[PDB]
Amino acid sequence: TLVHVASVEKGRSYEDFQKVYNAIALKLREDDEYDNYIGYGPVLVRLAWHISGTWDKHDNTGGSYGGTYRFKKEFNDPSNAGLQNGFKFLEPIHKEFPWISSGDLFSLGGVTAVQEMQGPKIPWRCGRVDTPEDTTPDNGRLPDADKDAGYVRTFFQRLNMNDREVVALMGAHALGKTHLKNSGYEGPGGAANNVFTNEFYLNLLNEDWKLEKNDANNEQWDSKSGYMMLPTDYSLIQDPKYLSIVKEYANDQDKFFKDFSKAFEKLLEDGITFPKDAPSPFIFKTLEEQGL
Ligand code: HEM
Ligand SMILES: CC1N[C@@H](C)O[C@@H]1C
Asked: What class of enzyme is it (predicted)?
C-alpha cells in the first residue's frame, strides 16, 4: 500500500524554482575547485540518483519524495559515502531558499548539474514533501558494483527501468570519478569528466580494457589510457542486448541525450503521484541562456 501525492510548496511558481536552479548553477561555477577541479556537478547527479534509487515499486517505499536522505540512517548508508559533499554543497542553498522541500532540492541539484554540464534538458516537477524519520528506507537498496549483466537487469527491475533505460542512465558514469576511500574503486571513466557527453559508450567500445585487482582488492576494468570501468559498467558490453544499445548511444549523441532525459526524470519521479491539475513539468533555462 502507499501513496505519495505531489503537493506544490505554497505560493510557489516556475520563477521561484528558476531562482533555486540559478543559485545551484552559480555555486557550481563558483566552487570550481572541489575534487581536483572536477567541481560539484558529478556528485550532485549521483546524490539525485541515490536519493531516488531506494525506491521499490512493489510497496512504494523509498524514492525521492520524502527527502529521507537528511536522516542519519540513509545519510550514513555505506552506498552513500562521498555524498556528504553534495549535501554540504546544497546546505547554503537550502538556507537561501528554505521554503523548498528536501526531496525537491536534491533532485533539482541533479537536474541543474546535468544541464549546466552541457547535458540534455531534463523537465522537473516540484511537489515532493518531507516525511518523518521512520519513513527512511533501510540500507542495501542501491546496487553493488561487483556483479554482472544479470544482476544489473534484476536490480533496475525494482525501479521499473528496462534495458534501454538502464543503459541510458549508466552513461552518467561519463561524469566524475570513483574514489578508493568512498567505494573501494579508483580512477576516472574518460577525458571530459565534467561535461555531459556520450563518452562512456565510446570508451566502453574503443579503449583497450584489462581486468585488474585494485588497491582495495576489488576487481575493475582498466585501460592503457588510465580510464576505468566497474564490472557493472563493463557488463553493458558483455551482454548482447545491452551491447547493441551501447553502440547505438556511441553513434547517436542526440539519441542518448533524449533517452537519458526521459529516464532521468522517470528516475526522480518514481513513487510520486501527480494530481491531474499539478503544474506541468518545468524546463529551466541554464545560466548561459539567461546570459548570467
Ligand atoms: C549498477 C548501477 C550503478 C553502480 C554499481 C554505481 C556505482 C558507482 C560507484 C561505486 C561510484 C563511485 C563512488 C565513489 O567512489 O565516489 C559511482 C559514481 C558515480 N555514479 Fe554510479 N553507479 C550506478 C548507476 C548510476 C546511475 C544510474 C547514475 C545516474 C544516472 C550514476 C551516477 C554516478 C555519478 C555522476 C558518479 C561520480 C560521482 C563523483 O565523481 O563523485 N550511477 N557509481
Ligand atoms: C562509476 C564510474 N564508472 C566510470 C566510467 O566513471 C564513473 C565515476
From this structure: oxidoreductase
For this experimental structure, what is the resolution in angstroms?
2.5
Q: What gap in Å lies between CA 288 and CA 292, rounded to an integer? A: 6
- Way it was determined: X-ray
1-142+264-292 carries CATH number 1.10.520.10: yes
Instruction: Say if CB 281 and CB 8 are below 8 A apart.
Output: no
Among 251, 238, 257, smallest CA distance to 169 is for: 257
110 ligand 2 Cβ < 6 A: no
8 A C-beta contact, residue 75 and residue 69: yes
* Contact 177 CB / ligand 2 (< 6 Å): yes
Q: How far is the centre of ligand 2, averaged over its atoms, from the C-alpha of 178 (Å)?
A: 6
Task: Please state the domain extents for the chain.
Answer: 1-142+264-292, 143-263
Ligand 2 centroid from CA 132, angstroms: 33
Q: How far is the CA of 200 from the centre of ligand 1 (A)?
A: 12
CATH superfamily of the 143-263 domain: Peroxidase, domain 2 (1.10.420.10)
Query: 185 in ligand 1 pocket by Cβ < 6 Å?
Result: yes
